[PDB]
Every structure is written in structure tokens, then in C-alpha cells.
């Protein structure tokens, strides 16, 4: 079907310099045995465009401190020690874009819209070099669809033939990533058979997906647990 | 410090009244959720893509599919739904989002707020600027005055923005000031305080109410 | 229970004379009937309407046509419709034709606070003639507005007291983006449950969107073309 | 009539394996039931469902489910549903891989007509979207009413657009602006067309 023997094989499919789109949140929903398989391949030269940078130990953040990334796309970074000093070297670009932008942007990619208006960031540095537009007598900003060469994604289930479930919060970009990937691979805890999944259950049609692969239930990172008792 | 925080904190409670759809930002205002009376029922949306946060979960019954903003492991309400991020934005975009109740690192006198950023100390923006712009009513909850005793109610700001005109109704430890057409206007005032405390502690200018 | 209300005809009472109203349906799949035959029977006139089609003559939107409450429609089919085809031919209706995947667009884009945004759809045809052309990447793009109404009149399959809603099959559609777009937005739906009887990872419209909630037929479900093996 | 029989069974040839395509209204929709066995592929229907499967047996026929055309229908194994907004993410992305679509007209530069006749008028539906988004366009359209133009005179659906044209009569393709014919007698066809049109 669409489904790869293993993760391996899959990072075959990224090549220095390429734009990777990576789904999750935190650590949460995010492809993390798709990322150590990159790590492992050593490819180089990544503009890399997810909502955060993992942790500095965990998820993007792997490729961070190998080396990997040119350029970073994201709403937000966290506490990377490894990352404030290659940005403060000129080693590495970085984009930080709103996170409702970010959304926005790789949908509007994923579905073929160029450009879009917003109000978020005007009057800000965000604004500067977009174009403006007044609309019913307020300011918007023009925003950009991003589009990637590979993009990287974690599902709950996957069918052979590419469709997606989600669960819970691990949700987040995954299926707006899904759409905007020029190759979408999508790692997931369970490979059912194409129609174990109720048609309206799924969340992103196998369309826009064109690989598949098994990946791990047992060991999500929590990244702060916080409970009562 | 702990008082200055608990009275921040309850005076924002009171602007959660019953059927919000209600945002909660990082830091302080997250405090806000626990001190929610129960007359008041209303829905906390996380823009990770969740409507209708809920309390820690019990020990052990932790997920990690399921987290707040803040990256924390949390828990679902009675009639909670999950949705992916452009949803998330185009809710909170498209202004269906009643509150938002933000922290703050400076305001000014048009209520411009700016509270991602300080040059020279770099993390991120997250869902700030779109919030800003997208939630109908905009609250920000801040200490009125830094640890060097500098003020942060002010004429400009001094830090990169999150959003140009976009507060509503500030509240500090000391003074409640509220937004209407870029002017600041002193609205209400916490136990300790006077107009003159207030003065005295704002580089911003502001009309002091009719009534206080 | 607390969204629901008692019927159709209370619902209508919130629909005023000149406002644009958003419908969800394709053809006449997923149209909330008894919504509109209440408009039809409450009488508001000089009508806005914005939904894919027009039903037919005899059924869905048409039926206020005919009754002649609509000023202006903004749609993308007429097809098998003979009142709507004629009075557009004649002038006596104002319509403003959308090609599909612009009009699911504005709509959208209504709901979630985007004024205008770009697209390749219509360029070189009438239908792009007096908006922004916009070059991005060499070719060229129109300009399309965010669509907003008064009212949004949604059909959905199951709806719990609180507003969320599960479509059916194709009977999906536009109902998820109209909701979005309407100032006040009524659901029906042909189930009601309890808020807490929805799976979360199942709604396709969070309650968020949904104002009031009133119960609709599922037998009174018509059928265009009966096409069987 | 047998006309339009030569022109589906030619039209099921430009389908390969994998593909995700989109049959529009009328003539193209006919196809459907032609695909090989060997050739497994989904097709979309604009209102929202990923694997448009055959007509449903009597008595089984759902109102909920239905295609772009208003037909009852059936979906396949594996089909999903989703909203209109996204039908045209899909659609207006690119990631269909092949429309289908029939034509009043279709000009030399390969311009599409297919939505309106000025005082007839159907409208546009799906169509613009999808010869806009679609990678491969392609058209079957009986060949005179002639309809194969110089330059269009009804309201175009698209501006050189279309990839191949297949006709009762013979099939044209488009390179950058001028049309040839890779596919059949000969003589007939300069007398009949109205365009202008090379081959080798």
C-alpha cells in the first residue's frame, strides 16, 4: 500500500537543503521516530518549519544540535540552550511567526491560496515588508501560504492508504502539515487495513498522504506531567 | 509578590461571566480557572486545539496527547471537542472568543501591550498576537511596578509589542484602568491605594473616571 | 437543556427582514428543511441568501424564491432549478455567481476572521472582472472577501445541548463553514443528545460556532436523482 | 450514438493507477464504469467525498450520500468525507492528479467553455476550481453541435487550460499555446474543426 518497511527508508526521502514541515506541539503528536531516522541520515541545510523546536534532548530539537537546520520556522522556542547560540552565531536563521499565522500559512499552501490578510502582528514588528489593506476601516497585514518539500507527521491510526486519525491535543498541525507537504509521510501507532476507519471519523483523507509508517505508543515524552491527588 | 498575585488574580475572575468561551494565556492568568465560581459556567479554549479545558488529571492517569498552552498534562470537560490549529486561529481569529486574559511585561497609554520579548534576554510569540487581535474582550493582568522599581504603565512602550491598541481593561496590583479610543482612563483602585500611589507609580497618562 | 429550543418557528423569529443568511446543503443533501420552511411561513423578506445552490423549485431555498423573499443570491449552481435559472436570465433576481471553491472560501474565511485572500480560480474569465489581481510567484491571483451573515442555518445529523455538531456522509458539505461565518447560528439536526454523548475527537463543529439547537426530520430527507443498480 | 461510446472507452485511458480524479457532470461521470480491474484509484466528488463508488441497490439508496450531479451513489472501501472548504484545499492545491470535464467550446489555445450560454445558464460549480487546481485537464466534448474554435464565443470556464481534448472524431493536446492531434479518417477533420491545429 503506501506503507514503508521502516523509518529508515522514509528519511531517504529528505535531502540537504529541502523544507521539512513537521506536525506536534511541545512534544506532544509530534513524529518522533521519523526525526531520529533524519538525525541518523546526517542530511543538512533544513529550513524547518514546525510550531516549536521540541526540547533540546526530544523531538526537533535533535536536529537542532546535530547541526541540521539553516533556517527555523516557528511560533516559539523554548528553553534551547542549543538554540540561543547558533541564532547569536549567524549560523541560524530564524522566523518567528505568530502561531495563528503559522497555522494559516501552511493550510493556505496546502491549499493552493498564495496569500491571505490577518490582523495578527499589525502595527508590530511582525508587519514589516507585508503588504497592507484596509477592509470594512481597519488595517490587515498580508500573510504568505508556505509549502514544503517533505513534511513529517504523527497520527493515532493510519490505513494503508494514508488516512489519518488524530487523538486528543497530539492533533495541532498535523493535518494542516499533511496538506502542505510536496512528500507527507505520516508516522503512526497503528496501521489498520483501508476501511477499519470510519470514513467520518478520519481526519485527513488519504489524499494527501504518500507514505506511511509504524511508530511508538509505549514511551510519550510528557514534557511536564502535572497532576493532583 | 503573593498578595500583588492574589489580588490580580481575583479581581480578573469577576470578568468571566456565565457562557464565555474564555482564553487563558501563559503564566498568571492560567491561576484565574481554579477560582471560578460555580454559578458560572463557561468553556476555556486551549489553541493547541481543544475547547473545554479541564483540572490536572489524577496521578497516574496522566496523557500525553492531552495538554494545555503551557505544555502541561491536563484534563477534558463535560462537552469538550478537539480540532486542529487553523481552526484553533480561526476561532480565535474570526472572534468567537468572548476574553482573553493575558499577561503583560508593559502597557501603554493607548493600551498597546507588549509581553513576548525583552532585546537581549529571544523565545517567542505562540498565540499572543493572534488573541490580541481576535478575542472581544482584551485583559491583561500585570504587576504595576518592576524589582528596580520602575513602573511598566506606560506613555510608549519600551519592548517589542504584541499588539497596537489592543487592551481593553488592564488590571494591576495596585489600579484597574480601562481603554476606550486610545485613552487611558484609572478605573478602579485595589485596598492599599490611592489616586496619588497611582500617579506617583504611571509614566503612562490617564483620565481618572467620573467615579472610581 | 440548555441550546435546544422548542421549534422551528421560534427559531425563525430571530431572522430579520434585509439580513444575509448563510445556508449549509448541497442540492438538496444536508438543507435544514423545516428551518426553512418556517422562513418560508414566518414571511421575512428582502433576503440575502448565500448557499451553494438555490434547492430546487419545489424544495430547500427555492422555496422562499418562489415565495420571493430573497433580494439578492450569492451561490455557485443553478442547475436543475427553472424559477432561479429564469429570473437570473431576466434580471428579476440579483445573483452574484461564485465558482464553488471560492465560495466555500469566503465563507470560511468569513468565520475565521480572513477580509480577503487570493486564488487562481476565475482568472481570465467575466467572473474576475473588477477585483485585485495580485502577481505571486509569476502567475496571477484575484482577490476574494470574507463572507459574513446575520444568520447561519445549518443541517446536521446529531447536535448535543451545547451545540456540537456530527455531519453524515456527504451530507456535510458546506453545514461546518457556514456555521462559522453567521452572526447568530441555528443547527438542525435530526438527533439531539445530552452534551458529554458526543466523542470530542468525532464533532466536526465545536459548539463554539452554534447558538441555538432545534430538532429536524430525518425521513423528510428528499432525493434529487434516484440512481439505482 | 455509439459516438460517445468510442469517447469514454478513450477517456478511461487517460487514467492511470494510483490517481485521484475528478469526474465532472454529464458525459465524464460515465467513465466511472469503466475502470479495469487493475486500476485502483479513488474518485472525488466536490461535495465532500474521497471514493465515489457505483449506483446503490434499491431500497438501499441513502439521501445523505449523493454525487456533485445529485445522484444517489455509493462509497468505496477506505472512502473519507470531509467539507467543502477542504474539497477545495484539495482541489485548489493541486492535489488532484486528473479532471474530467465536458465543453460547449473549446478554443485553439485549448480555452474551456463549459458553464453558460448568454440568455441557459446552469453555472460554474466546481468547474473553474478544477481546471485551475487540477495537474491534467481533460475534455470530452462531441465534436460539432461546430465546437471546436478558433477562439470561444460563449463565457469561458478556463483560459488555455486544457491539456487533451477527445472527441466523437479524434484527440488534440496543448503545448504552450497551439494545438496538434496525436490521435484519429484525416481528411475530415480540417473541413470539421473550426480551430487550427498541427501534427507530425
Same mark, same amino acid.
Given at each position: 500500500?503506501?506503507?514503508?518497511?521502516?523509518?529508515?527508508?522514509?528519511?531517504?526521502? %529528505?535531502?540537504?537543503?529541502?523544507?521539512?514541515?513537521?506536525?506536534?506541539?511541545?512534544? @506532544?503528536?509530534?513524529?518522533?521516530? =521519523?526525526?531520529?531516522?533524519?538525525?541518523?541520515?546526517? $542530511?543538512?541545510?533544513?529550513?524547518? $518549519?514546525?510550531?516549536? @523546536?521540541?526540547?533540546?534532548?526530544?523531538?526537533? *530539537?535533535? =536536529? =537542532?544540535?546535530?547541526?541540521? %537546520?539553516?533556517?527555523? %520556522?516557528?511560533?516559539?522556542? *523554548?528553553?534551547?540552550?542549543?538554540?540561543?547560540?547558533?541564532?547569536?552565531?549567524?549560523?541560524?536563521?530564524?522566523?518567528? $511567526?505568530?502561531?495563528?499565522?503559522?497555522?494559516?500559512?501552511?493550510?493556505?499552501?496546502?491549499?493552493?491560496?498564495?496569500?491571505?490578510?490577518?490582523?495578527? *502582528?499589525?502595527?508590530?514588528?511582525?508587519?514589516?515588508?507585508?503588504?497592507?489593506?484596509?477592509?470594512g476601516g481597519r488595517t490587515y497585514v498580508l500573510e504568505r501560504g508556505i509549502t514544503g518539500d517533505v513534511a513529517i507527521v504523527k497520527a493515532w491510526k493510519a490505513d494503508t492508504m494514508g488516512n489519518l486519525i488524530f487523538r486528543k491535543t497530539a492533533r495541532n498541525f498535523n493535518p494542516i502539515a499533511a496538506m502542505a507537504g510536496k512528500i507527507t509521510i505520516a508516522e503512526a501507532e497503528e496501521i489498520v487495513e483501508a476501511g477499519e476507519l470510519d470514513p467520518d471519523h478520519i481526519h485527513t483523507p488519504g489524499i494527501y498522504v504518500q507514505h506511511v509508517v509504524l511508530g511508538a505508543?509505549?514511551?510519550?515524552?510528557?514534557?511536564?506531567?502535572?497532576?493532583?491527588? | 509578590?503573593?498578595?500583588?498575585?492574589?489580588?490580580?488574580?481575583?479581581?480578573?475572575?469577576?470578568?468571566?461571566?456565565?457562557?464565555?468561551?474564555?482564553?487563558?494565556?501563559?503564566?498568571?492568568?492560567?491561576?484565574?480557572?481554579? /477560582?471560578?465560581?460555580?454559578?458560572?459556567?463557561?468553556?476555556?479554549?486551549?489553541?493547541?486545539?481543544?475547547?473545554?479545558?479541564?483540572?490536572?488529571?489524577?496521578?497516574?492517569?496522566?496523557?500525553?496527547?492531552?495538554?494545555?498552552?503551557?505544555?502541561?498534562?491536563?484534563?477534558?470537560?463535560?462537552? #469538550?471537542?478537539? !480540532?486542529?490549529?487553523?481552526?484553533? !486561529? #480561526?476561532?480565535?481569529?474570526?472572534?468567537?472568543?468572548?476574553?482573553?486574559?493575558?499577561?503583560?511585561?508593559?502597557?501603554?497609554?493607548?493600551?498597546?501591550?507588549?509581553?513576548?520579548?525583552?532585546?537581549?534576554?529571544?523565545? &517567542?510569540?505562540? &498565540?499572543?498576537?493572534?488573541?490580541?487581535?481576535?478575542?472581544?474582550?482584551?485583559?491583561?493582568?500585570?504587576?504595576?511596578?518592576?524589582?528596580?522599581?520602575?513602573?511598566?504603565?506606560?506613555?510608549?512602550?519600551?519592548?517589542?509589542?504584541?499588539?497596537?491598541?489592543?487592551?481593553?481593561?488592564?488590571?494591576?496590583?495596585? #489600579?484597574? !484602568?480601562? !481603554?476606550?479610543? &486610545?485613552?487611558?482612563?484609572?478605573?478602579?483602585?485595589?485596598?492599599?491605594?490611592?489616586? /496619588?500611589?497611582?500617579?506617583?507609580?504611571?509614566?503612562?497618562?490617564? #483620565?481618572?473616571?467620573?467615579?472610581?
Amino acid at each position: 500500500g503506501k506503507v514503508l518497511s521502516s523509518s529508515k527508508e522514509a528519511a531517504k526521502l %529528505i535531502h540537504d537543503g529541502d523544507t521539512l514541515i513537521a506536525g506536534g506541539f511541545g512534544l @506532544c503528536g509530534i513524529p518522533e521516530q =521519523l526525526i531520529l531516522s533524519i538525525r541518523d541520515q546526517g $542530511v543538512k541545510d533544513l529550513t524547518v $518549519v514546525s510550531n516549536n @523546536c521540541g526540547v533540546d534532548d526530544w523531538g526537533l *530539537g535533535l =536536529l =537542532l544540535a546535530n547541526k541540521q %537546520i539553516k533556517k527555523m %520556522i516557528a511560533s516559539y522556542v *523554548g528553553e534551547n540552550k542549543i538554540f540561543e547560540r547558533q541564532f547569536l552565531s549567524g549560523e541560524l536563521e530564524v522566523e518567528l $511567526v505568530p502561531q495563528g499565522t503559522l497555522a494559516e500559512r501552511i493550510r493556505a499552501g496546502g491549499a493552493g491560496i498564495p496569500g491571505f490578510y490577518t490582523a495578527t *502582528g499589525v502595527g508590530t514588528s511582525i508587519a514589516e515588508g507585508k503588504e497592507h489593506k484596509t477592509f470594512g476601516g481597519r488595517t490587515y497585514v498580508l500573510e504568505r501560504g508556505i509549502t514544503g518539500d517533505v513534511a513529517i507527521v504523527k497520527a493515532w491510526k493510519a490505513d494503508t492508504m494514508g488516512n489519518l486519525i488524530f487523538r486528543k491535543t497530539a492533533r495541532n498541525f498535523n493535518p494542516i502539515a499533511a496538506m502542505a507537504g510536496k512528500i507527507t509521510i505520516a508516522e503512526a501507532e497503528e496501521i489498520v487495513e483501508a476501511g477499519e476507519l470510519d470514513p467520518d471519523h478520519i481526519h485527513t483523507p488519504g489524499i494527501y498522504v504518500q507514505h506511511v509508517v509504524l511508530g511508538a505508543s509505549q514511551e510519550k515524552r510528557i514534557e511536564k506531567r502535572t497532576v493532583q491527588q | 509578590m503573593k498578595e500583588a498575585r492574589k489580588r490580580m488574580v481575583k479581581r480578573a475572575v469577576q470578568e468571566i461571566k456565565d457562557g464565555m468561551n474564555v482564553n487563558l494565556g501563559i503564566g498568571m492568568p492560567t491561576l484565574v480557572a481554579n /477560582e471560578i465560581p460555580d454559578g458560572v459556567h463557561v468553556m476555556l479554549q486551549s489553541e493547541n486545539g481543544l475547547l473545554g479545558i479541564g483540572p490536572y488529571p489524577l496521578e497516574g492517569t496522566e496523557d500525553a496527547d492531552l495538554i494545555n498552552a503551557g505544555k502541561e498534562t491536563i484534563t477534558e470537560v463535560t462537552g #469538550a471537542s478537539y !480540532f486542529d490549529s487553523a481552526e484553533s !486561529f #480561526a476561532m480565535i481569529r474570526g472572534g468567537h472568543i468572548d476574553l482573553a486574559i493575558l499577561g503583560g511585561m508593559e502597557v501603554s497609554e493607548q493600551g498597546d501591550l507588549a509581553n513576548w520579548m525583552i532585546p537581549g534576554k529571544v523565545k &517567542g510569540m505562540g &498565540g499572543a498576537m493572534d488573541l490580541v487581535n481576535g478575542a472581544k474582550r482584551i485583559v491583561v493582568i500585570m504587576e504595576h511596578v518592576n524589582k528596580h522599581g520602575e513602573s511598566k504603565v506606560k506613555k510608549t512602550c519600551s519592548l517589542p509589542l504584541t499588539g497596537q491598541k489592543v487592551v481593553h481593561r488592564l488590571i494591576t496590583d495596585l #489600579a484597574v !484602568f480601562d !481603554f476606550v479610543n &486610545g485613552r487611558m482612563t484609572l478605573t478602579e483602585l485595589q485596598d492599599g491605594v490611592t489616586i /496619588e500611589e497611582v500617579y506617583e507609580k504611571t509614566e503612562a497618562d490617564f #483620565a481618572v473616571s467620573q467615579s472610581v
